[PDB]
């Protein structure tokens, strides 16, 4: 896979080659793959490979990454959330 | 996503933003997402976003979280379990 | 399971008994199992047991393994990737 505009990766704290879960709001499909960085500013969200069977151009999806940490740190942990609208306009 | 009454999260030892598995007893669907806290005493169990394709109001579900620990600790580990009935009445 | 030519495992850095994700490019199925080593040079990719319900001889698949590491190490991490063509000819 899933090429994502590098600006999006930076905002959500997601790294290239990191595991990500993709939950499809449009068709309800949920799958896991890994992140690839796409050119900055392109606003690209490309589902490549076998994953092309789970999402179509135009589908709304939620992409998430998970990390592990000691319970004491988890208590105050805060995730990096980026919101979008229109044609991948980061609001 | 799944907003869960903070009291329920407290009883099960589940943290906000922690990854959770939801197993639908009603329809048999099994999915993973993360927990969000709902105001205490609200008794809310809300499946939002893409998750709304896997559960409906009225469905009976089991919500579980998993943690990692060394083998010795694992052998003496006791899970935090809460049982429900009726109008999400804890026992 | 999935017996994989030991040479292929070597190129991808995959270990025997290591958990692997198999993404079927042909039918779109995605499943997880563990790797078994097949004799070197055999070029075997065998889906055995319950896995045989997700892949058939002839199917094109992507086999991946994931590891965990601290954030600093993650940012400089480079995956071991092997590409194939024809009769499972590595490039």
């Amino acid at each position: 896979x899933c090429a994502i505009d590098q600006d999006f990766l930076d905002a959500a704290g997601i790294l290239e080659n990191e595991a990500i879960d993709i939950w499809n709001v449009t068709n309800g499909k949920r799958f896991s793959t890994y992140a690839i960085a796409a050119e900055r500013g392109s606003r690209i969200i490309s589902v490549n490979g076998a994953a092309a069977h789970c999402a179509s151009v135009g589908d709304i999806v939620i992409i998430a990454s998970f990390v592990t940490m000691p319970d004491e740190e988890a208590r105050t942990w805060r995730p990096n959330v980026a919101y979008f609208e229109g044609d991948n306009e980061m609001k | 996503x799944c907003a869960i009454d903070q009291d329920f999260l407290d009883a099960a030892g589940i943290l906000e933003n922690e990854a959770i598995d939801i197993w639908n007893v009603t329809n048999g669907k099994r999915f993973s997402t993360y927990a969000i806290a709902a105001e205490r005493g609200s008794r809310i169990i809300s499946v939002n976003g893409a998750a709304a394709h896997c559960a409906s109001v009225g469905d009976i579900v089991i919500i579980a979280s998993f943690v990692t620990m060394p083998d010795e600790e694992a052998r003496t580990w006791r899970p935090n379990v809460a049982y429900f009935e009726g109008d999400n009445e804890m026992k | 399971x999935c017996a994989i030519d030991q040479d292929f495992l070597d190129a991808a850095g995959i270990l025997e008994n290591e958990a692997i994700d198999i993404w079927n490019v042909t039918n779109g199925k995605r499943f997880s199992t563990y790797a078994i080593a097949a004799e070197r040079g055999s070029r075997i990719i065998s889906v055995n047991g319950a896995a045989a319900h997700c892949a058939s001889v002839g199917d094109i698949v992507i086999i991946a393994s994931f590891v965990t590491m601290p954030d600093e190490e993650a940012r400089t991490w480079r995956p071991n990737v092997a590409y194939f063509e024809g009769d499972n000819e590595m490039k």
Partner: peptide, 24 residues
């Protein structure tokens, strides 16, 4: 014990391209 937490997420992005034959 170690917890698995949400690191971050891109909420409601649109798939712009799908390439089944991708080899990279």
């Amino acid at each position: 014990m170690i917890r698995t937490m949400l690191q971050g997420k891109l909420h409601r992005v649109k798939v712009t391209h799908a390439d089944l034959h991708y080899e990279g």
